[PDB]
Amino acid sequence: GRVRTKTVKRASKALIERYYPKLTLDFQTNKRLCDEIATIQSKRLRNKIAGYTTHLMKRIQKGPVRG
């Protein structure tokens, strides 16, 4: 499956909790901004966190969400 784990989901939560007046819903800018705002130890993990952050931004734009 493509179920994102806690290591990805919680990191995306924290990024969105502190950087909402920040990175938009574009994945490329989201990941390039994760590159500077977070010390992620693998390109794959940073890609996954950025993708989940983009997902959460897109789902916020349709209304708010828990967390």
Partner: protein
């Protein structure tokens, strides 16, 4: 000699030195050797907890070790030299801890007391987790195994090759052999080389 066979034989030579120094400098707190090959002479760096008994009175012991390695591996005299400077941290070396607890068991000491002492020393020497497994005929029985662990220990993945120190010892009790497995989860923060945290650990700046 081809490069393949030469570096294979270099690894073999390092392994042979490692076993020799394990058997020779065991009571001296040996923890590992480093072989540096220079164009003129080869330096053999011993890492020991107590580098005064390795040296000996006025260097007699280290000089006889040098000449022993000299004769064994057939170098021209003067082309190989030994330096036993220091181990950076006694408590973070699995080899040193395993040998120390082996020596305590041999001198006569409760297994639980010795292992918990080793674990406590490792934990208070900055390690983020330690485990000691003592297996065998602890008392006359079906040769059970005891574990004594503190902290956490990731085992396993890649980070275990990255930073986990594992050492195994064979201890000779009057009824058979006890097996010592010492496993140290050193702190990734003070790595001073390589990754500074776990692969999944994410820190955010704000």
């Amino acid at each position: 000699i081809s490069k393949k066979r030469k570096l294979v034989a270099d690894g073999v030579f390092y392994a042979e030195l490692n076993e020799f120094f394990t058997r020779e400098l065991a009571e001296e707190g040996y923890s590992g050797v480093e072989v540096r090959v220079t164009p003129t002479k080869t330096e053999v760096i011993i890492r020991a907890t107590r580098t005064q008994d390795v040296l000996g009175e006025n260097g007699r012991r280290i000089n006889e070790l040098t000449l022993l390695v000299q004769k064994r591996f057939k170098y021209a005299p003067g082309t190989i030299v030994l330096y036993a400077e220091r181990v950076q941290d006694r408590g973070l070396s699995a080899v040193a801890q395993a040998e120390s607890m082996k020596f305590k068991l041999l001198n006569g000491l409760a297994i639980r007391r010795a292992a918990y002492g080793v674990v406590r020393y490792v934990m208070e020497s900055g390690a983020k987790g330690c485990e000691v497994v003592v297996s065998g005929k602890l008392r006359a029985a079906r040769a059970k195994a005891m574990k004594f662990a503190d902290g956490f220990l990731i085992h396993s993945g890649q980070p275990v090759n990255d930073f986990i120190d594992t050492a195994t010892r064979h201890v000779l009790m009057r009824q058979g052999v006890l097996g010592i497995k010492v496993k140290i989860m050193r702190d990734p923060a003070k790595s001073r080389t390589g990754p500074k945290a776990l692969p999944d650990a994410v820190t955010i700046i704000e």
